[PDB]
Design a protein around this ligand. Structure first.
Ligand SMILES: C[C@@H](CO)N(C)c1ncccc1F
Length: 171
């Protein structure tokens, strides 16, 4: 049976209980923590690509008020559908399953300034989602996993000083 498990779930949860924040910049910022998953029950002989996108979690934006995240207005029009191809794509099931799959090079941006970056809206909540794409398949079979532990708000700067501190502590 295909299983995709979140690595360092305990670490993600320490950020999620504060409300997680990720920085977006003109030139794109790598994530901390890094999304890493373990994979079982692929066909070790088949070839697959791994894709990552970010699903808008709400029909409103957020604001940090009196040390609390609160609904902060109506949303902006949704960010363009940005998909990151894991640089090991395409590869054998055996490759994907032998060691955790790390998305360490993906960059979050608030400008469509190219470079395979993911465009997000500041002060909007996103949930990372991994797709597994079987190569050479006439049915173009895809599997999608969502990682609710990894929810965060895109920010141009940290709002919660505890998040700022957590990021320095564990990174
Ligand atoms: C929560 C911590 C242990 O305090 N832990 C599970 C960690 N896991 C991965 C990277 C860094 C970590 F520190």
């Amino acid at each position: 049976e295909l299983r995709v498990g979140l690595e360092e779930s305990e670490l993600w949860l320490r950020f999620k209980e504060l409300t997680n924040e990720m920085i977006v910049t003109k030139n794109g910022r790598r994530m901390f923590p890094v999304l890493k998953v373990n994979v079982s029950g692929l066909d070790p002989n088949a070839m697959y690509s791994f894709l990552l996108d970010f699903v808008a979690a709400d029909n409103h934006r957020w604001k940090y008020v009196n040390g609390e995240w609160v609904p902060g207005g109506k949303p902006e029009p949704q960010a363009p559908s940005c998909v990151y191809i894991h640089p090991d794509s395409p590869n054998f099931g055996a490759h994907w399953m032998k060691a955790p799959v790390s998305f360490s090079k993906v960059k979050l941006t608030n400008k469509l300034n190219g470079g395979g970056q993911i465009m997000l809206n500041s002060l909007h909540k996103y949930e990372p989602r991994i797709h597994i794409v079987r190569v050479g398949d006439p049915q173009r079979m895809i599997t999608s996993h969502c990682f609710p532990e990894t929810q965060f708000i895109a920010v141009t700067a940290y709002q919660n000083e505890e998040i700022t501190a957590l990021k320095i502590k564990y990174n």
